[PDB]
Design a binder for this molecule. Sequence first.
Ligand SMILES: Cc1cc(-n2ccc(C(=O)Nc3cc4cn(CCC(C)(C)O)nc4cc3C(C)(C)O)n2)ccn1
Length: 286
Amino acid sequence: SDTRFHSFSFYELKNVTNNFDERPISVGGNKMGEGGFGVVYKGYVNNTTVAVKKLAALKQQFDQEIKVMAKCQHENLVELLGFSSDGDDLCLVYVYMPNGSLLDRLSCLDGTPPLSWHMRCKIAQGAANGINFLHENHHIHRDIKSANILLDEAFTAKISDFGLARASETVMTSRIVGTTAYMAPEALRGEITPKSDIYSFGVVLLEIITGLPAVDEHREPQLLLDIKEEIEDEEKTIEDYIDKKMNDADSTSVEAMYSVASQCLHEKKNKRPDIKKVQQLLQEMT
Ligand SMILES: Cc1cc(-n2ccc(C(=O)Nc3cc4cn(CCC(C)(C)O)nc4cc3C(C)(C)O)n2)ccn1
C-alpha cells in the first residue's frame, strides 16, 4: 500500500535484487549506481519496481534517511517506501526512478537520447521546488548535485539522498561533508547554511546549460563553476558553452537560466538569492 512504510525482511530484499547482483542493470544484473554509503539495486516487491540501497561494510545514514524522509514528503522529493534491519546489512527501499539521475541523462549514459531544452527547464523548476520545500521545512540538504536529482517516468525532478541533511529551529561543523565540485566557499570552511544549497544549485544549472560534468580532469577549466569567471572576463560567452546535444535552445531563455546560475554562484553567501527568488526567476524564464 501507499499509505504506510513497510518493514521488509533482508531475505526478501536479497531475493528481489538477485542476491544483490553487482553487474550493471544494462548487462542483466541489478546495480543501478552507488551513493556515498551504499550501492542502489533494482528490485521487484508487490509487482512494483523499487530501488534498494544496501548500506554495506552507516547506521547513522540509516536512521537519518528514515527520520528526514518521514518528515519531508513532496512531489519533487524521492519517496521512501520501507527499510530492513533484521538480517546482516542495513537496507533502504525507495520508489524506483525510471529515468535515473539528471547526471546520467545529461551524459546520455546507456544510449538514452539527449534531454531537450524544454525538458531541461522543467527539471530545473522541479528541482528548485523540491529545495524550496526542504528550506521551508528548515532542512539543509548539504549534497545538492546532478547525481542527487532523479527523474521519474514523466521526467519530474526529485531531490534524493538525504543522508547528509541537517535541521534547524549561521552554524559551524568539525565534520565537513559534501561534493567539492559543488560546494560553496563557506561550506568548504565548515559553515552550515541553506545558502550553500543555493550555490550547489547554481553548479547544477550550469550542468543543465552545458551538459558538462562539474569536474573533469581532462578539461580547461577542470571545475565547471570556473566558466562563470571566463564569461565575466569576456574570454568566452554562454553561447560557446551551450550543450550541442540540443536543437531547441534559444539564447534568451539560456541567458535567463545562466543569470540565475550566476546569481546562485556569488562568492558572498548573503548576496545569493534565496530559494523562493530562484523559483520566481526560473518561472519568469518560461
Ligand atoms: C543514492 C540514493 C539513491 C536513491 N534512489 C531512490 C530511487 C533511486 C533510483 O531509482 N535511482 C536510479 C534509477 C535508475 C533507473 N535507471 C535506468 C535508466 C534508463 C533505463 C533510462 O537507462 N538507472 C538508474 C539509476 C539510478 C541511480 C541509482 C543512479 O539513482 N535512487 C535514494 C537515496 N539515495
